[PDB]
Structure 1
Amino acid sequence: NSYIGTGLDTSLENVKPLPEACKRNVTEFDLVAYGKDEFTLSMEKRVMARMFSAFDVTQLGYLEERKIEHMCKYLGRVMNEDDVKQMKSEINAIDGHITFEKFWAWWCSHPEVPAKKDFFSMVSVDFAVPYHQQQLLTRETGELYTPSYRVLYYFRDMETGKELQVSPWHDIPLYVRDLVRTKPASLPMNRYNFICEIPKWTRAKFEIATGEPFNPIKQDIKNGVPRFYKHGDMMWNYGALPQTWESTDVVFEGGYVGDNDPIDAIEIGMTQFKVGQVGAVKVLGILGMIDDGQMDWKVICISHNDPICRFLKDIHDVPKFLPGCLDAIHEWFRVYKICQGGVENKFVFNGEFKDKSFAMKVIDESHYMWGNLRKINKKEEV
């Protein structure tokens, strides 16, 4: 804030502020921004004149018609091949030297074409990338608490409306990706899909049937009697991330001893998911538990739709808004087998909750192994 600038490199010192500003003791910025009146023609002149001198770099007192033409395009005027001619004719400056007065006289007399505006620039990267969006659908079938119970998945082409059964394991994308991401680039990507197997506040077991076609969710029934966590209810939604695989075969050079299931995840928002429900989550960290000698990661995440999600930036924020959460999660997994004759479970990294960068890395390795699990089978049989 001070005075109206031209927008080209200049110098303060010898520029005289419009008189109406000085008289009032208000800067020009302030007068044009907040003064209720518009600038007079007298006032615009003194401004355009300063613009003229700016363009007059060789400060010679006039400008060549090629400059006056850039200046015009700089001031916003649409100067086509025709218009430029009309200006020269108007100024009729045989030597092509145009004075300010002659310029200003011409400007004021030709507020250029009205509706000619009807020109719209259409340049565009034209990233013509069309696609039928799918809407995920789930359907239960069978009787709850029996072996027929299954939660099936389908995509609905919201274009054709055709339904197709899909595998929540292979078909639901792991990363939730925007075709054109609008969130600040300064903000890293953290948006994943999560599949609830066991809802918050419940102890009945369910899981993705990795062995059946389309990988529907089934109840864990053994000898015709549904299974349950006897230790107590679960208190967060427990589930899994799609397109991942904790291979029991080490598959790369820093490979661990997976358990052959999609990576496990715990979502800590306030809302209970229903069985097999899918939703976008934000990964906050991870906890490594040992299960029968196998590495059994539990990704800690929170639904993007929870009211506090936006304040939970990493795993250190959880004890700040959900005190007790990470302690209860840790203690619950350490001891859930003891009431069944088992013993406490052990954890890697001293049972500490690793942060999001660490989690996301584990999640990618898991995505990678899921990917290579596809290659081997998807290609060999084919």
Structure 2
Amino acid sequence: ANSYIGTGLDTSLENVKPLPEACKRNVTEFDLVAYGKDEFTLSMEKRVMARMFSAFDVTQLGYLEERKIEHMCKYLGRVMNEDDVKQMKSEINAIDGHITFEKFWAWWCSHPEVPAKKDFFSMVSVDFAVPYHQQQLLTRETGELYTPSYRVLYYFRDMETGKELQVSPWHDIPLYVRDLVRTKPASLPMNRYNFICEIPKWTRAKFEIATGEPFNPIKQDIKNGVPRFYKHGDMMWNYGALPQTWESTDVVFEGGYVGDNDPIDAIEIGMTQFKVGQVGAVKVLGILGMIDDGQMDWKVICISHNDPICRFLKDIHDVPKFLPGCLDAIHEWFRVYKICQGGVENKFVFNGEFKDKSFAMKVIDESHYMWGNLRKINK
């Protein structure tokens, strides 16, 4: 389809006579039609109309029957109704039934058709919709910061009723951000999750999802009325959890390591700091399996979908390409952050390698699968 215009059916390439308006200027007829002046029109359509007439006349005799002429006009985009068929057979003068191209072409060019009437619109849909009222997540701070009263609460504002409910950011904020109708490539896999930030980039004060309290707010880590802070240094990336997940203790991971009874941890390596309790969509890129006291303490490595570089980061191997030093720094921070308190370096499975996204994603599901049961056992 780069030489000459065709029929759109099945034919040979050899015997079709190339528009005489093309051979003359030695330019294919495709180039002539698309990029030439409009003089390769009515006279140009003629030959493309003659070759298509030859394409329905397979028993190449020199004419079609009033039955073929019919679909061909359906083929060429024309809305042939009964009131226009008889008109056709009436106009077309062939008392024997046979119609020659010359006769057909002349008739065609003399009846663009009746565009009037009522221009029809097919309403055929598959009507697939949902009642679900999109909810707006809201986060309100209350209490005084760096004291046992400060909390971060979560709410849904019905974007239809405008009514508000308090939710658990752990149970009610979707782990998977899905789209009713996904328009991104079929070929490109789904990688969009919600991330709840607990410890903001560049800070060292401890906060956590209160798994004990109702609606699981975000509270600060406070022992005997004094707030707690990481002493090794500040968290240099947003650090929080992926909601709707649970590292169950009743379970064994990568050898003989039990979960830590916590929602899975995530580290957001983007350049933008989140506020305590802030939720945002992330892209999972890998996972670091650390052991926290014989417990399997993973760390999902994700990047905010809103980061300048998220698009160039496909898997865990590109992080060193665009964010050199990041992983080794992330590794090292976690490996040694307890030593300043008089503990010892933490250990890792997989020889501390940052396992890729597919590995990370499976881990996330299992974590999600366990949260699901915890929902039913406790209900």
Relative to structure 1, the CA distance from residue 342 to residue 355 in structure 2 (aligned partners, 3 Å threshold; closer, same or farther) is: same
364-373 vs 254-263, which moves further: 254-263
123-132 vs 224-233, which moves further: 123-132
Q: Following TM superposition, by how much is the alpha carbon of 1:149 offset from its aligned partner in structure 2, in angstroms?
A: 0.6
Contact 1:231–1:337 (CA under 8 A) maintained in structure 2: yes
Alpha-carbon displacement from aligned partner over 1:162-190 (angstroms, at most 9, x marks no partner): 11111100000001101110011110110
Say which SS state the counterpart of residue 4 (structure 1) adopts: coil
Contact 1:32–1:38 (CA under 8 A) maintained in structure 2: no
Q: Following TM superposition, by how much is the alpha carbon of 1:251 offset from its aligned partner in structure 2, in angstroms?
A: 7.9
183-192 vs 242-251, which moves further: 242-251
2:37 maps to: 36
162-171 vs 130-139, which moves further: 130-139
10-19 vs 24-33, which moves further: 10-19
Shift >4 Å, 4+ stretches: 251-256
Q: Following TM superposition, by how much is the alpha carbon of 1:17 offset from its aligned partner in structure 2, in angstroms?
A: 1.1
Q: Following TM superposition, by how much is the alpha carbon of 1:129 offset from its aligned partner in structure 2, in angstroms?
A: 2.6
Relative to structure 1, the CA distance from residue 60 to residue 115 in structure 2 (aligned partners, 3 Å threshold; closer, same or farther) is: same
Contact 2:253–2:296 (CA under 8 A) maintained in structure 1: no
Contact 2:264–2:298 (CA under 8 A) maintained in structure 1: yes
Q: Following TM superposition, by how much is the alpha carbon of 1:83 offset from its aligned partner in structure 2, in angstroms?
A: 1.7
Alpha-carbon displacement from aligned partner over 1:278-303 (angstroms, at most 9, x marks no partner): 00000000000001110000000000
- Partner Cα distance (2:20, 2:180) in 1: 54
Q: Following TM superposition, by how much is the alpha carbon of 1:43 offset from its aligned partner in structure 2, in angstroms?
A: 2.3
Unaligned runs of 5+ in 2: none
Say which SS state the counterpart of residue 252 (structure 2) adopts: coil
Relative to structure 1, the CA distance from residue 327 to residue 204 in structure 2 (aligned partners, 3 Å threshold; closer, same or farther) is: same
Alpha-carbon displacement from aligned partner over 1:57-93 (angstroms, at most 9, x marks no partner): 1212111222211111111111123222221222243
- Partner Cα distance (1:128, 1:86) in 2: 45
- Partner Cα distance (1:167, 1:223) in 2: 26
Say which SS state the counterpart of residue 354 (structure 1) adopts: coil
Q: Following TM superposition, by how much is the alpha carbon of 1:255 offset from its aligned partner in structure 2, in angstroms?
A: 8.6
Q: TM-score, normalised by structure 2?
A: 0.96
Relative to structure 1, the CA distance from residue 64 to residue 265 in structure 2 (aligned partners, 3 Å threshold; closer, same or farther) is: same
Q: TM-score, normalised by structure 1?
A: 0.96
Say which SS state the counterpart of residue 169 (structure 1) adopts: coil
Contact 1:251–1:369 (CA under 8 A) maintained in structure 2: no
- Partner Cα distance (2:250, 2:354) in 1: 25
Number of aligned residues: 377
1:293 equivalent to 2:294? Answer yes
Say which SS state the counterpart of residue 347 (structure 2) adopts: coil
- Partner Cα distance (1:192, 1:254) in 2: 27
Contact 2:32–2:40 (CA under 8 A) maintained in structure 1: no
1:188 equivalent to 2:198? Answer no
Taking only the aligned residue pairs, the percentage that are identical comes to 100
Unaligned runs of 5+ in 1: 378-382
Q: Following TM superposition, by how much is the alpha carbon of 1:117 offset from its aligned partner in structure 2, in angstroms?
A: 5.8
Q: Following TM superposition, by how much is the alpha carbon of 1:310 offset from its aligned partner in structure 2, in angstroms?
A: 0.4
Q: Following TM superposition, by how much is the alpha carbon of 1:256 offset from its aligned partner in structure 2, in angstroms?
A: 4.8
Q: Following TM superposition, by how much is the alpha carbon of 1:196 offset from its aligned partner in structure 2, in angstroms?
A: 0.1
165-174 vs 121-130, which moves further: 121-130
- Partner Cα distance (1:5, 1:254) in 2: 65
